[PDB]
């Protein structure tokens, strides 16, 4: 049959391709439909999906399985250079708690009032803006590949000596496990997220 | 003041960061808000933006400035061109005309009836699925950085010896040119898209 997956952009570009490589190898007769959007659009449109994968909090009224947590890093140029409070900060607008945690960190760790010059609602765009030198930002660790360790310094973001983390959840209606292609997907994801 | 830009994912990750590096260097007192979404969502929510940048067709009842055209390439692992009809094809669901041109091309150029095993509505995800070996696909040339020429063969997609192209447009209400931060943006984009 067909499986329909709804996910955020970050997930579509970092988690799902490796999952689906496995999934399609094991279950080659399943047709896969992936819809990628803003988290808000995804959750709003949950009736279009058998399974959703998103970051933040659990989705109410559904089963929610914790996939993993990600650390965060403040990223700025070595090359231009470490007088960092004069560079524009790119604020990824995750949700209000996150934004506030980041503002608090910036105020505690740097030497001026927080001010976002650029706001963006997709992490991958935030990363490319960093790479193109628009400004500095905070990225989740899973997005930190292909960032030049010779152009850029990375500082782990901790609040009250606790790492700033964000959770990824897979959410679905448990009734959907009656579809063999969905049960297969969910079982595969439970093994995928375990680490040796 | 503030400028609010709506764009597709592809644009947010490939065109806009270089534009905004320039824009923010020249106009450092403008606050920039970027919303990245599915084209359909972007077009639907046009009242949230001063300017939109999208691919496909012009937006009705707005000014529309053609930015550029992109060629397309069929991409598959260097193991191998004959095996290629056995690999899953990943269908980016741009719009019906595009999908149908791709289907016609596949039928005319390969040894099998067209069938998409995976459908996806974001190009960046399509590219990551290619890189992770889920299957083969067609990408616009602007997305073809960081694809290893040692793992992958690239064949240019032409139909009736005409290259398959897709257009990028900037769309806006011409009244918005009364905002200096928007007029600045639009003038800057007009220079950016010219090639020396």
* A9 touching B (Cβ < 8 Å): yes
**Which residues of chain B from 143 to 182 reach within 8 Å of chain A, CB to CB?**
146
Helical axes B16-26 vs A123-131, angle rounded to 10°: 60
Residue of A nearest to B136 (CA): A21
Residues 6 or more apart whose CB falls under 8 angstroms from that of A194 comprise none
Residue A16 has its nearest CB partner, among B32, B36, B125, at: B125
Q: How many independent structural domains does chain A possess?
A: 1
Q: What is the domain range of residue B79?
A: 1-196
Residue B20 has its nearest CB partner, among A9, A13, A129, at: A129
CB count, 10 Å around CB of A19? 19
Separation CA A166–CA B182 (nearest Å): 35
Half-sphere exposure of A150 (CA within 13 A, CB side): 0
Copy the structure tokens of residue B156: 């240019």
- Method by which this entry was solved: X-ray
Separation CA B143–CA B160 (nearest Å): 24
Chain centre distance of CA B174? 24
Separation CA B153–CA B139 (nearest Å): 12
CATH number at residue A184: 3.40.190.290
* A28 with B121: Cβ contact below 8 A: no
Resolution attained, angstroms: 2.0
Alpha carbon dihedral A70, A71, A72, A75, in 10-degree steps, equals -110
Separation CA B11–CA B34 (nearest Å): 11
Closest CA to A167 of A11, A43, A5: A11
User: A129 and A137 in contact (C-beta within 8 Å)?
Assistant: yes
Residue holding tokens 């769309």?
Answer: B171
User: B15 and B24 in contact (C-beta within 8 Å)?
Assistant: no
Write down the number of H helices and E strands in chain A.
6, 12
CB count, 10 Å around CB of B125? 27
Chain centre distance of CA A50? 20
3-state helix/strand/coil string of B134-162: CCEEEEEHHHCCCCCCCCEEEEECEECCE
* A119 with B33: Cβ contact below 8 A: yes
Mode of pairing for the β-strands spanning A63-70 and A166-172: antiparallel
Residue of A nearest to B21 (CA): A134
Q: Is B37 exposed, middle or buried (0-12, 13-18, 19+ CB in 10 A)?
A: buried
Copy the structure tokens of residue B105: 């091309």
């Amino acid at each position: 049959g067909t499986i329909s997956i709804g996910c955020s952009s970050l997930i579509g570009q970092t988690l799902l391709p490796e999952v689906l490589s496995l999934y399609n190898a094991q279950f080659p007769n399943v047709e896969i439909q992936v819809q990628v959007g803003s988290t808000e659009q995804i959750k709003a449109n949950h009736r279009d999906y058998h399974v959703m994968i998103t970051r933040g909090n659990k989705v109410m009224n559904l089963a929610n399985t914790h996939l993993f947590n990600d650390d965060h890093y403040f990223i700025f140029p070595k090359n231009r250079r470490d007088d960092v409070t004069k560079l524009p900060f790119i604020e990824f607008q995750a949700d209000p708690i996150y934004i506030n945690q980041i503002k608090q960190w910036y105020n505690d760790n740097l030497e001026q009032d927080y001010h976002a010059t650029i706001t963006v609602d997709q992490v991958a765009t935030c990363k490319e803006m960093l790479i193109s030198g628009v400004g500095v930002t905070i990225l989740p660790e899973i997005m930190m590949k292909n960032i030049s360790k010779e152009q850029f310094e990375f500082e782990k973001v901790e609040i009250d000596n606790e790492p700033l983390i964000r959770s990824t959840f897979m959410s679905y209606d448990p009734s959907m496990l009656q579809l063999p292609q969905v049960d297969s997907f969910v079982n595969l994801m439970a093994s995928f997220v375990e680490q040796p």
